[PDB]
Design a protein around this ligand. Structure first.
Ligand SMILES: C[C@H]1C[C@@H]2O[C@H]1[C@@H](C(=O)O)[C@H]2C(=O)O
Ligand SMILES: [Mn+2]
Ligand SMILES: [Mn+2]
Length: 325
């Protein structure tokens, strides 16, 4: 009898004619909360589509916020899916009236990286002009190989799915500028003076980052409190001082930068006299750091950063870096 066969009844949320909808996203978040897996065909469809969307973007996303329009900027999330859901509960779901920017490092370290990245990609498809993803140093092959994401994708899906993730990450833009005044990138500024927005737009980004150069710096550099630059403590890119930030901002007619890429106990830091802000959105990082996290609110008519701090929420018993080397 027809009632006795089973096909895809029990395999979870499905796209609507291959497309992301709000209902799908709500179903997906619940499915993931309950530690279940998105059907591989749906994951594939999300990846192919988001690759297409991202590949049409400039390396520098340039966004205009009208006077009364707001946006939220989040820093690193590192596969802390339950904390990601908490951000949406604290700050509202993404929408055309509640836009978000996630400033890189979505994956690795935390062991729900697949759930974070597919949720973020789903929202990018749903609200392509109001949900922004910028590349971090962890959206790269070398980092994924060591720090969990490659292992996690291979465990949950296959090596072929991982290859596709790698290709998609290559199209993530490297920076975003709001109203010609606030520049957002994962890492920071440059190992030499005189770089302008033109240079960022010119980066052919669909690749793994070079060992040095502007693409490397955007993903890897850190501020230092003293003037000038130093070779990075990380062995990649540089540390840049307040004079570097100020010269860059002045030449480019910008007010300040928002970057991520470093943990802060309070979830954020205001440095370089207000010119360099760090936002970090992974509370109690790797279940050990004990840090608060934050996200930033901004408005078209007032682009000053307003910080909202939050703390970690419970998650299932999977250890951080369970999938790592
Ligand atoms: C220790 C954490 C601070 C930042 O996130 C983690 C680390 C990491 O991503 O490996 C840093 C980075 O973004 O490079
Ligand atoms: Mn990070
Ligand atoms: Mn980083």
């Amino acid at each position: 009898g027809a009632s006795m066969t089973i096909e895809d009844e029990y395999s979870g949320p499905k796209l609507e004619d291959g497309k992301v909808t709000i209902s799908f996203m709500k179903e997906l978040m619940q499915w993931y909360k309950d530690q279940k897996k998105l059907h591989r065909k749906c994951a594939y469809q999300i990846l192919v589509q988001v690759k297409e969307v991202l590949s049409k973007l400039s390396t520098l996303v340039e966004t205009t916020l009208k006077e009364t329009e707001k946006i939220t900027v989040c820093g690193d999330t590192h596969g802390q899916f339950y904390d990601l859901l908490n951000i949406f509960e604290l700050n509202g779901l993404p929408s055309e009236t509640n836009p978000y920017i996630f400033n890189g490092d979505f994956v690795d370290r935390g062991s729900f990286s697949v759930e974070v990245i597919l949720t973020l990609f789903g929202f990018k498809l749903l609200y392509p002009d109001h949900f922004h993803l910028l590349r971090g140093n962890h959206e790269t092959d070398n980092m994924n190989q060591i720090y969990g994401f490659e292992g996690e994708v291979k465990a949950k899906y296959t090596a072929q799915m991982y290859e596709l993730f790698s290709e998609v990450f290559e199209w993530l833009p490297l920076a975003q500028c709001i109203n010609g005044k606030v520049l957002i990138m994962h890492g920071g500024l440059f190992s030499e003076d005189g770089v302008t927005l033109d240079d960022i737009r010119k980066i052919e980004r669909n690749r793994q980052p070079p060992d040095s150069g502007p693409m490397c710096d955007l993903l890897w550099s850190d501020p230092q409190p003293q003037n000038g630059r130093s070779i990075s403590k990380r062995g990649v890119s540089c540390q840049f001082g307040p004079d570097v930030t100020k010269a860059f901002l002045e030449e480019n007619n910008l007010d300040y930068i928002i970057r991520s890429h470093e943990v802060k106990a309070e979830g954020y830091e205001v440095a370089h006299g207000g010119r360099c802000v760090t936002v970090f959105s992974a509370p109690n990082y790797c279940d050990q750091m004990g840090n608060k996290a934050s996200y930033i609110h901004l408005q078209g008519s007032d682009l000053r950063p307003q910080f909202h701090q939050f703390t970690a929420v419970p998650h299932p018993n999977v250890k951080p870096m369970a999938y790592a080397n």
